[PDB]
Design a protein around this ligand. Structure first.
Ligand SMILES: [Ca+2]
Ligand SMILES: [Cl-]
Ligand SMILES: [Hg+2]
Ligand SMILES: [Hg+2]
Ligand SMILES: [Hg+2]
Ligand SMILES: [Hg+2]
Length: 251
């Protein structure tokens, strides 16, 4: 039925998993610049198409589909590692991201993780460019066999934090995913997570058609409370949001 409306809304969670591109950093211009360059000597490669269909995909997987002659892990690592310096020094934080990452750093490190389709050499530089501490639990492109939209990166994250899915009682193992992209939202949902959609890459109208449970403009809508050692939980607070599903608070 109709969305929730009351603010703030408070949710006890066991862990939080964060996407990087579009969620922590607006790296999309840098990534688009890379794809245009990649395509410049490939007549069969429609960079425009690839840029807009591959949000949240591993670069290796986009290349495997659209230019498979170049689907070589070391080569892709080399290409991606160059992106931050060449095209991404002007990349900005999703508003509130720096603050939220700092607030997460104050919690036990086992309460959160990053799971990105970016390679490690690219993603680590994004944190440096925003002056955010590199995350301790940090899942990247080559840490998984299957990338988003398959759940593997998010399964690996929740399992690594000590909260595998509890199918019988999902309220005993409560994990939220923060994501901007359809691929990531599908992956998060398939990993049994509650989903916070960030309306950066896409707008509210678009994300209302996707499996996110709550949609926010950015992270200025979001705070974290105090760790509770007894329940191994932390309080997630939404000071504001654009849309929240009627069952958001239920697992
Ligand atoms: Ca993303
Ligand atoms: Cl929603
Ligand atoms: Hg796009
Ligand atoms: Hg953050
Ligand atoms: Hg999950
Ligand atoms: Hg949604």
């Amino acid at each position: 039925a109709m969305p929730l409306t009351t603010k703030p809304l408070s949710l006890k969670i066991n862990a939080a998993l964060f996407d990087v591109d579009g969620t922590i950093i607006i790296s999309q211009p840098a990534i688009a610049a890379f794809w245009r360059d990649f395509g410049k000597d490939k007549p069969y490669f429609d960079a425009e198409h690839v840029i807009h269909i591959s949000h949240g995909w591993r670069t290796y997987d986009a290349i495997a589909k659209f230019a498979p002659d170049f689907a070589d892990e070391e080569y892709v690592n080399k290409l991606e590692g160059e992106i931050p310096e060449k095209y991404g020094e002007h990349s900005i934080e999703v508003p509130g991201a720096v603050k939220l990452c700092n607030a997460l750093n104050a919690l036990p490190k086992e309460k959160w993780a990053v799971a990105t389709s970016g390679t490690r050499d690219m993603a680590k530089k994004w944190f440096d460019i925003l002056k955010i501490k590199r995350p301790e639990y940090f899942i990247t492109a080559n840490d998984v066999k299957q990338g988003k939209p398959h759940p593997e990166p998010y399964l690996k994250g929740r399992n690594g934090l000590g909260f595998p899915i509890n199918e019988q009682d999902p309220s005993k193992s409560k994990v939220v995913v923060f994501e901007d992209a359809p691929a990531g939202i599908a992956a998060g949902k398939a990993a049994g997570c509650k989903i916070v959609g960030i309306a950066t890459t896409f707008d509210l109208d678009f994300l209302k058609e996707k499996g996110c449970d709550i949609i926010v403009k950015n992270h200025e809508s979001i705070r974290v409370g105090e760790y509770n050692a007894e329940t191994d939980e932390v309080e997630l607070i939404f000071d504001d949001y654009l849309y929240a599903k009627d069952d958001l608070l239920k697992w």
